[PDB]
Amino acid sequence: GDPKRQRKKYETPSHPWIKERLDRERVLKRNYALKNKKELWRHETQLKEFRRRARRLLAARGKQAEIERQQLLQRLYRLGLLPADAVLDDVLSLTVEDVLERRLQTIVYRKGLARTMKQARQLIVHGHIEVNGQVIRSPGYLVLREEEDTITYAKGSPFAKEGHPERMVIEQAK
Amino acid sequence: ARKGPKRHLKRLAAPTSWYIHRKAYKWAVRPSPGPHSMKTSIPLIYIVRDYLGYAKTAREARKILNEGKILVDGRVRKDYKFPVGIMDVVSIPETGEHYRVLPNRIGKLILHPISEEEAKLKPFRINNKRMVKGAKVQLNLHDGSNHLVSLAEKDAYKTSYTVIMQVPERQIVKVLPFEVGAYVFVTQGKNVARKGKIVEVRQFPMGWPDVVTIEDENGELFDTLKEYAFVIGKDKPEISLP
Amino acid sequence: MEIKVTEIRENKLLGRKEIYFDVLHEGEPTPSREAVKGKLVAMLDLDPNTTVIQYIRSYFGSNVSKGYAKAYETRERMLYIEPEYILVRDGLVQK
RNA sequence: AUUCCGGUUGAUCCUGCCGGAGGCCACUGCUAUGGGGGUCCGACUAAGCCAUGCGAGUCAUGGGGCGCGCGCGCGCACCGGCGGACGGCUCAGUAACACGUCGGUAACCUACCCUCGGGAGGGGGAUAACCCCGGGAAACUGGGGCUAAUCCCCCAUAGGCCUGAGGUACUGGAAGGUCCUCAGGCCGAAAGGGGCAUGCCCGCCCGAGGAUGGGCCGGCGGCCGAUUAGGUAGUUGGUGGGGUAACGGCCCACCAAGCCGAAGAUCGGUACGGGCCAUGAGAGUGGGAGCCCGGAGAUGGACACUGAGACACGGGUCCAGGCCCUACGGGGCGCAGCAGGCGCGAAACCUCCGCAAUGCGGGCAACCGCGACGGGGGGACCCCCAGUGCCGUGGCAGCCACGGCUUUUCCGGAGUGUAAAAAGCUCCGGGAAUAAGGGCUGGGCAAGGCCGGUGGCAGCCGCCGCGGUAAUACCGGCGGCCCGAGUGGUGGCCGCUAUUAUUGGGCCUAAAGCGUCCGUAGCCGGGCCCGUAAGUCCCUGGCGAAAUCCCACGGCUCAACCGUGGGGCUUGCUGG
């Protein structure tokens, strides 16, 4: 036989030159400041896997089936996409915008630590952002529900001083 | 084409009863022949290094073993390939520690801590019986050991009874028979590590082994093979089990 | 740099104490072995000899490193058990 | 995403094939900043040929001697013991009990290991090392003297094997088996050794069992060909024997004529088998080099010694086919081991460091050794995470100038890391500095109805089709679209394809009903009652190695990766 190779964690479109999809993805890329098409497809594949697991577990008989059901719902709650009182049928209503909202770049933007998504990406990559007690440099870390209230500037960082010029300019808006 | 016996073992080909990281290195310790089978035992090196944590390297473990500090069944064992198996006692006097080797509900071997008084007894299941020259009776036990008895008391022993013995000197105590109200602990199969009381035995023709029905400690019944049932008492276990 | 002992074990067979500790250094580089050893012994009342430091390990962003140390009673048992490379690395023996 | 689009006409509806659009593998054009993880890198053609160096030793607690230092301590070779039959490499041959799964051996062998029961009595001998002579180009090798042992032999006793007559104590489902008694015979043990000490440690022989590793047997399962139809002659069976560790036409003497086959034998072709892998919504189609289990082989072929185990990958003998040294007398070698070289080709790396980790051999141990293994070096192998700047004012229609900020990355330095290094990780200084291309631009199909040049020439073109003086289709420039450290070309597989159709296709006229009928095997078969329980359904026991696949939690910053647990997979077999 043959041994196993490692396979991509993202999928490509079936046709590369469809106007509707092109427009949609262009808008999303521009609005969320994504480097390339590959990122979008990664998040879309995450969502598709969630949806497929839901479809498979829906109305299936077995202790392992109910176990998997509860595990799925609790994992979604912990990721921050559904609330605590949610049912399996609520997964078929999720979008890729939810996953795109749950990432560190978008959150650093929403929380007013940056003025633009590009500035947020630069801060994250240069190492001025610390999650509860850890510096992280991957703008697609997908912050969890139990860490969104512990995001701030790193201890050793020019932006950690109230009287930094760029920090003043950033606070201007808020 | 292999022209002789094996002397090596790869980790991915090791038995499932062990607690071992399979994708870390390429080689494992190949156990030497000894008391128990390969699927029901494990070498001492792993007990000393990966289970209890008294060492980080095989050199240290081997020094510990060659200094005469680990006992099995009450005997000093220096071979790092020596296999340890079900119902065996591992004792360390420099720490007053005593463990019994048993299986889980998955089939993996764990160490259950016991007391210094119960650490002096080991139960042995009788697997076979023979006549030896001089008209003596030889009992062949489950760990592969043998015991001699006289012709006058041959009916007091059968091929599924249990004998408790003081382990370093190996003197017999408290024979336990196989009956319809005896307490048993299962060692192999799907119902491994369960315990209960015997209800019924069933025989079959032409080589097919016999079967035994057991009642759980709460009312549930199950079945297994009579060779996988280890008698430990009459109505109450005689050793500390998990 | 500050030190905080997380766990201690006694190995009665090899005759040693195994110490797991943390080292907090915020704004500073990774501390040397000399300083860590000096502080360790000064605090826990250990012989400066018969004490060997294994890895000091830094992490991605922590300003908090981890450490493992071994404290022996006699020096002969030490030289018998431990390999020569950590001894040369700590400075208790020459190459 | 369980999908469609272009092409037969002056126009239309069908059938039917070609092409586009997706993924994976190998080769290749242009281009290229960083880190991490992993089971990637002379498999496809030549299982073709090889210079040089290495890949298997160890024991002074088995023995005698020799040299060096104060009987003692260090070093060398020899005798002796264990090992060298594993590990490592390749895929030629093999269509077979070779492989897989379930079972059996009451028809067998097993050094190292475990348990129990028992023993170690009495004698002798040779010979390496060493000394005196050497021979020979080498490879190798003769004579004399002297000697020891855990070396070799003999005697004894125990013990092993065969047969016959009895007794019925044991196991098991069932005794050509084990136990007891008697008899007649064959073979026939042992190192009471070494060390410490005033008994302990390591060892030797016998017996009963186990374990480990094998040998043998059976049921079931698994490619294409009829322009391959009859095949087999120790072939099928029986009686009696021989041989084997063991059953057996395995072999022999005698007595018979049986065995396989259209449900496809025999013969030929191709091929290592599986766990698994690619693709697809699935049903399914194809592959099975890299990791694990098993098999086979060591230039081609055959045959033996020693050993528990070989018909022996770094041991032996002969033939064939190649090569090397030679004083010409004779001698030696075969990398499908690691590096490395030639050749064949479209097609594949350093003649590097270490036994620190995992393991194996030897050793009471301490420890020694290992091109296994680990670590780095080279490579557009696969996967994961990032970068080539950001902010503000103004302007133009994404880019310009002005001002400010940051340092992942880059340059340099100190620690930690490491067997030693290196990478990585913490910290310091400098500085927007140091880092985008490839293909396309008439329609399928997303983006120019701009400029110039050429002028059925040159060129383009998966397919349709452009080009003949006004070219949106050729070449260049300027713009624009797609992907993006990658992007294009050529071959192969899956899908597209309901163009192989069980699910799920067609046969009046588009390809397709034998000219008609009778009937053999096979497939399909009316209604009611009784029985059985082979198929069929439910429940429960023993199996279907691990890795790989799905889910959750945990540890390396997250992730890829690793660990714990629950399910699945193993197309199934078997007891009730």
Side-chain angles (χ1 to χ4, degrees):
Chain A
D2 295 313
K4 187 62 182 332
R5 302 208 195 183
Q6 284 172 34
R7 307 298 308 288
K8 283 174 175 71
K9 296 278 154 84
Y10 73 82
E11 302 152 8
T12 66
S14 296
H15 204 289
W17 301 312
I18 306 190
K19 194 173 261 299
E20 317 287 20
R21 181 187 271 274
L22 285 176
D23 294 332
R24 280 198 277 104
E25 298 186 341
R26 194 181 295 129
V27 170
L28 288 177
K29 185 179 183 291
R30 173 165 192 169
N31 277 342
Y32 280 95
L34 299 173
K35 184 181 197 286
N36 64 34
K37 285 311 190 78
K38 192 180 313 185
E39 306 181 9
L40 257 191
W41 299 338
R42 201 162 84 212
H43 298 306
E44 297 170 337
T45 311
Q46 286 153 12
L47 181 74
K48 283 192 258 158
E49 293 311 302
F50 290 138
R51 295 190 72 254
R52 285 170 193 150
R53 292 174 52 195
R55 284 187 250 161
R56 181 179 69 238
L57 299 170
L58 197 144
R61 306 158 86 250
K63 294 166 70 69
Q64 197 60 30
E66 59 86 3
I67 285 171
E68 301 273 290
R69 196 177 301 126
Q70 298 319 319
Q71 289 179 339
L72 169 66
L73 282 167
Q74 278 154 34
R75 176 67 176 166
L76 288 171
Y77 178 76
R78 167 168 207 207
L79 294 161
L81 304 167
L82 296 180
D85 45 344
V87 290
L88 208 66
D89 189 74
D90 272 318
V91 189
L92 309 193
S93 311
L94 295 177
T95 67
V96 64
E97 276 100 327
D98 298 332
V99 195
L100 295 172
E101 275 284 326
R102 292 308 302 160
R103 52 187 270 155
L104 200 155
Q105 202 182 332
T106 308
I107 291 183
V108 170
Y109 184 49
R110 303 297 185 210
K111 269 169 75 102
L113 294 171
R115 312 162 59 79
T116 68
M117 285 266 191
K118 309 199 283 166
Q119 196 183 47
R121 194 169 181 117
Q122 180 170 63
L123 301 170
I124 296 158
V125 163
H126 287 193
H128 303 296
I129 298 292
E130 70 179 349
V131 188
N132 59 7
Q134 178 75 241
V135 171
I136 296 173
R137 294 188 177 156
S138 284
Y141 156 67
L142 284 195
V143 188
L144 301 179
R145 206 196 271 277
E146 298 84 23
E147 306 148 345
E148 200 188 345
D149 297 334
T150 63
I151 287 156
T152 178
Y153 294 113
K155 306 298 174 197
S157 160
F159 290 77
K161 301 282 141 276
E162 270 287 4
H164 205 257
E166 281 284 344
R167 198 188 175 154
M168 294 182 208
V169 183
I170 291 161
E171 290 148 9
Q172 293 294 106
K174 273 200 306 198
Chain B
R2 212 143 49 198
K3 294 196 304 289
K6 296 168 152 177
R7 315 219 64 77
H8 294 62
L9 186 74
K10 275 164 178 161
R11 283 206 169 204
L12 286 174
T16 67
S17 65
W18 298 6
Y19 270 99
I20 188 175
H21 302 348
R22 288 170 194 271
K23 304 190 124 186
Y25 311 92
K26 178 173 266 297
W27 297 112
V29 171
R30 178 162 184 97
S32 74
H36 310 85
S37 279
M38 195 152 153
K39 279 196 204 175
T40 50
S41 52
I42 194 183
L44 263 182
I45 194 78
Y46 292 123
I47 285 162
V48 167
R49 186 181 51 181
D50 305 279
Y51 281 54
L52 305 180
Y54 284 118
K56 203 199 211 178
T57 42
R59 299 204 185 167
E60 302 173 351
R62 211 174 300 197
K63 270 141 167 171
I64 287 166
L65 292 175
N66 278 305
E67 279 177 339
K69 268 146 186 183
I70 309 289
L71 299 177
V72 193
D73 299 4
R75 306 193 182 199
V76 183
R77 299 304 186 178
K78 299 172 172 173
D79 187 14
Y80 69 103
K81 291 161 149 277
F82 180 89
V84 190
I86 293 156
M87 291 302 157
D88 282 12
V89 191
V90 172
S91 66
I92 318 177
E94 289 187 17
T95 58
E97 285 175 274
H98 305 276
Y99 299 93
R100 176 103 54 198
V101 182
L102 304 153
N104 267 354
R105 298 278 289 104
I106 299 169
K108 314 183 90 170
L109 303 159
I110 60 162
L111 298 168
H112 183 58
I114 55 171
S115 66
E116 169 159 359
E117 292 84 335
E118 197 177 288
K120 278 164 205 167
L121 301 166
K122 178 175 166 179
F124 291 94
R125 188 196 165 258
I126 302 175
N127 283 359
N128 210 319
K129 250 172 78 188
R130 283 160 212 281
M131 292 294 299
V132 298
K133 293 181 73 67
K136 317 278 281 163
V137 181
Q138 197 193 49
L139 322 166
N140 322 110
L141 311 165
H142 84 285
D143 75 322
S145 285
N146 287 287
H147 195 254
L148 275 188
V149 298
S150 70
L151 179 82
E153 47 167 10
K154 80 200 149 58
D155 290 331
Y157 300 99
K158 311 290 279 161
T159 53
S160 306
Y161 292 12
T162 290
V163 178
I164 285 146
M165 298 174 73
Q166 291 173 225
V167 288
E169 57 265 3
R170 286 175 154 259
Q171 301 313 329
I172 279 184
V173 178
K174 187 49 159 183
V175 185
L176 309 172
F178 205 90
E179 285 188 16
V180 180
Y183 210 87
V184 296
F185 174 90
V186 186
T187 46
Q188 279 178 74
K190 167 191 86 202
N191 290 306
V192 55
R194 286 184 94 177
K195 40 190 82 70
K197 296 192 160 189
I198 292 167
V199 174
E200 196 214 337
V201 177
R202 297 204 65 210
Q203 284 213 350
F204 302 99
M206 261 278 279
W208 299 121
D210 302 349
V211 174
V212 71
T213 318
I214 290 143
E215 199 170 352
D216 194 305
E217 315 183 305
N218 68 47
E220 195 261 336
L221 300 151
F222 58 97
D223 292 352
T224 195
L225 295 186
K226 169 178 201 185
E227 292 82 3
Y228 298 160
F230 201 109
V231 183
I232 56 172
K234 323 191 152 165
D235 67 340
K236 183 264 286 178
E238 291 195 354
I239 53 165
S240 158
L241 288 161
Chain C
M1 46 156 284
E2 190 55 27
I3 287 177
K4 184 257 170 182
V5 165
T6 69
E7 197 273 331
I8 288 166
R9 296 187 51 176
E10 273 274 2
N11 197 335
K12 183 69 171 297
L13 309 172
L14 302 166
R16 60 163 64 153
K17 318 166 65 52
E18 294 150 355
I19 312 166
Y20 300 88
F21 59 101
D22 293 317
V23 173
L24 323 172
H25 55 89
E26 198 158 2
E28 302 152 28
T30 318
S32 297
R33 278 161 166 265
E34 289 81 339
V36 176
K37 185 178 177 182
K39 173 160 269 291
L40 262 181
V41 298
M43 167 151 64
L44 286 196
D45 191 350
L46 315 166
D47 183 321
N49 304 352
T50 66
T51 317
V52 285
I53 287 171
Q54 295 288 322
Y55 64 87
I56 288 148
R57 200 183 287 139
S58 286
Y59 285 75
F60 182 67
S62 295
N63 281 327
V64 172
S65 309
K66 300 192 133 187
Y68 182 45
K70 283 142 163 171
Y72 290 87
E73 287 168 284
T74 72
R75 171 146 182 141
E76 302 290 4
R77 190 72 178 169
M78 184 198 187
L79 285 165
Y80 182 63
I81 297 299
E82 289 303 313
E84 261 160 18
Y85 85 83
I86 47 162
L87 303 179
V88 173
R89 210 190 275 180
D90 268 329
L92 296 160
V93 185
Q94 305 305 298
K95 189 164 283 187

